[PDB]
């Protein structure tokens, strides 16, 4: 019996590359650093990036990891980030306000206020084709 | 500015084959399915499932998720999907106890007994090539 996610893990090319984006530009805490990997922390989420040197990214599809934001700081996350140069992967449509950014590598990230309780709650007013809950 | 991890998002080719795995082998509540995706939950986490029926699995490279499990219920949790025919991807040689499997369209998983914590005190006393804290 699983009791939630213990740690999400990202391929990564270029290490000092990628710790710099989640350190620097998205706030995370660097704990650890060696030859081949980093370990960091944002919340509770603990991040570990493992270097993978031919690495070529993600192939295009639907997969992706979002991080909570409070309403009042999206505004200038968003700006921020597109100020930096970030390349944007998806416009939002859904509830709550949301922004689709990629990391070094063509990971899919994402920027989210809201939470599952939110979503369901507008779900239940304006159903995607053919809904059901439980 | 982030808080943490909002939710988690894989493409899956067969959706009521995915909604079953999670749910009843790794024991996600299933809070709500449509035409094209579902909504699960385990502890905290929010997991999205998004039907995509020609995505091919993601390819070779280290991407993986993991979910938290108790010492206890680690033997146990291994030995059932073992006999369920799931598929491994790794064996583990790190710190605490993991089990490496695959899910139906070849995501990567992990369940893993310890945490950021457990995992730094135990490379201080023995370090990866290189490592450095902070
Ligand atoms: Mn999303
Ligand atoms: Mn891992
Ligand atoms: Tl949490
Ligand atoms: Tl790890
Ligand atoms: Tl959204
Ligand atoms: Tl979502
Ligand atoms: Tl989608
Ligand atoms: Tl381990």
Not at 90 to 112: I, M, T, V, W
Request: net charge neutral.
């Amino acid at each position: 019996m699983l009791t939630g996610l213990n740690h999400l893990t990202l391929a990564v090319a270029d290490l000092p590359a990628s710790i710099a984006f989640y350190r620097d530009l998205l706030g995370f805490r660097l704990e650890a650093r060696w030859d081949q990997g980093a370990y960091l922390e944002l919340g509770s989420l603990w991040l570990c990036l493992s270097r993978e040197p031919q690495y070529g990214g993600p192939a295009a599809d639907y997969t992706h990891y979002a991080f909570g934001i409070a309403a009042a700081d999206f505004a200038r996350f968003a700006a921020q980030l597109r100020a930096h140069g970030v390349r944007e992967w998806k416009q939002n449509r859904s509830e709550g306000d949301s922004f689709y950014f990629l990391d070094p590598d063509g990971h899919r990230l994402e920027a989210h206020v809201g939470d599952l309780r939110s979503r369901l709650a507008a779900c239940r007013q304006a159903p995607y084709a053919g809904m059901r809950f439980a």
